[PDB]
Amino acid sequence: PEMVRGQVFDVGPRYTNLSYIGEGAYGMVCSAYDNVNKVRVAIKKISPFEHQTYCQRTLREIKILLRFRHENIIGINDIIRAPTIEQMKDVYIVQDLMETDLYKLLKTQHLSNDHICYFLYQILRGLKYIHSANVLHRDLKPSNLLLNTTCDLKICDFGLARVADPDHDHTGFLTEYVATRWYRAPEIMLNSKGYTKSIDIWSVGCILAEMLSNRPIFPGKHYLDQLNHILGILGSPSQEDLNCIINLKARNYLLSLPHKNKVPWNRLFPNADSKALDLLDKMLTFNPHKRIEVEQALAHPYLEQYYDPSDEPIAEAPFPKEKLKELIFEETARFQPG
């Protein structure tokens, strides 16, 4: 049994020469040399079995990533676990090793307009596929966008993903939410469970703005402060957009606020390409019904040098704890010897 920081990282003999990368959700991540396909790979250890939510998130992601096949979505190459349910305490998921991620790049590197355009293209191309499978990612953020040494981008972490369900999107005001605060669309705080595709477009809009300045556009410090930040830039919603919020608590909150004018994108981002700011505006629309969709975003003039719908594939088909361990066991069976 291999050890790393005095903890079992039980992946051999196929995977050897381990290095600590970091700490993920529910366990440790390492690189390792794959002795079959002669390359280093990423391996993440997952120890979810005592809890409903770790099991749920682990299973959702395994099911999604095994069904998906797309250049801009991280795949699962292998899954390592014990041969019996009784002996299975951990699962190791083996994935392409990626040099970096957009979070690390944004903290250390200025991005040329050409890199921003390419990164955005790849994000939307992966998102087109996800959405075509009727799946919502629901936690798009720079740390979930992996990049290799040649700037190929892959979307990862499908632990919070859901099948879209627009007919049950509605909820009350200030309803709790799980996904990462700075990338939450305004409607989450007002009247939305985050069950429509427009939730992911908001996040991508936030990511684009962050690529333009290396700083998050809406860095809220707590639940309702997130809405403070959004309205600070977009300004007060129009009567028409306010009329779409039927719930009185949410409507009246918005009516209580002093008038705020829109901050022009070209003043917030003076060196940005004007076409990038037109697309940013359309992704960061307050009203989710008026927000641009993924396939429209791909067709935007900013992305004209890459847009090719014939090369932007879609999915072939749409999509207690004891039973969840059995379901994770069954779902990983295809990777066992025989």
Ligand X SMILES: [NH3+]CC1CCN(c2ncnc3[nH]ccc23)CC1
Is 223 among the annotated ligand-binding positions? no
**CA 203 to CA 127: how far, in whole Å?**
11
Per DSSP, the residues of 71-135 read TTB----EEE--SSTTT---EEEEEE--SEEHHHHHHH-PPPHHHHHHHHHHHHHHHHHHHHTTE
Binding of residue 146 to ligand X (CB under 6 A): yes
Q: Which residues contact 133 (CB under 8 A, 6 or more apart)?
A: 67, 68, 314, 315, 317, 318, 319
- Between 44 and 291, name the residue whose CB sits nearer to ligand X: 44
Catalytic residue among 78, 139, 157, 200: 139
**CA 202 to CA 243: how far, in whole Å?**
20
Torsion of CA 311, 305, 280, 287, to 10 degrees: -40
Binding of residue 58 to ligand X (CB under 6 A): no
What is the closest distance, in whole angstroms, from the C-beta atom of residue 70 to ligand X in the complex? 15
- Between 6 and 22, name the residue whose CB sits nearer to ligand X: 22
Torsion of CA 24, 77, 32, 81, to 10 degrees: 70
Q: Is 278 a catalytic residue?
A: no
Per DSSP, the residues of 235-261 read -SPPHHHHHT---HHHHHHHHHSPP-P
**CA 127 to CA 158: how far, in whole Å?**
12
Instruction: Give the footprint of ligand X on residues 81-140 (CB under 6 A).
Output: 95-98, 101
What is the closest distance, in whole angstroms, from the C-beta atom of residue 43 to ligand X in the complex? 9
Is 220 among the annotated ligand-binding positions? no
Binding of residue 313 to ligand X (CB under 6 A): no
Select the span of 16-24, 83-91, 185-193, 267-275 touching ligand X (CB under 6 A): 16-24
**CA 311 to CA 295: how far, in whole Å?**
12
* Phi, psi values for residue 140, rounded to 5°: -70, 130
Binding of residue 77 to ligand X (CB under 6 A): no
- Between 41 and 190, name the residue whose CB sits nearer to ligand X: 41
**According to CB under 6 A, which one of 12, 24, 220, 313 is a site residue for ligand X?**
24
How many residues touch ligand X (CB under 6 A)? 15
Quick one: the chain helix, strand, coil %, rounded to 5? 40, 15, 45
Binding of residue 4 to ligand X (CB under 6 A): no
Site string for ligand X, 255-294 (x = CB under 6 A): ----------------------------------------
What is the closest distance, in whole angstroms, from the C-beta atom of residue 155 to ligand X in the complex? 11
- Between 157 and 187, name the residue whose CB sits nearer to ligand X: 157
Binding site for ligand X (CB under 6 A): 21-22, 24, 29, 42, 74, 95-98, 101, 143-144, 146, 156
Which residues are documented as binding site for ATP? 21-29, 44
The residues annotated as belonging to the active site are 139
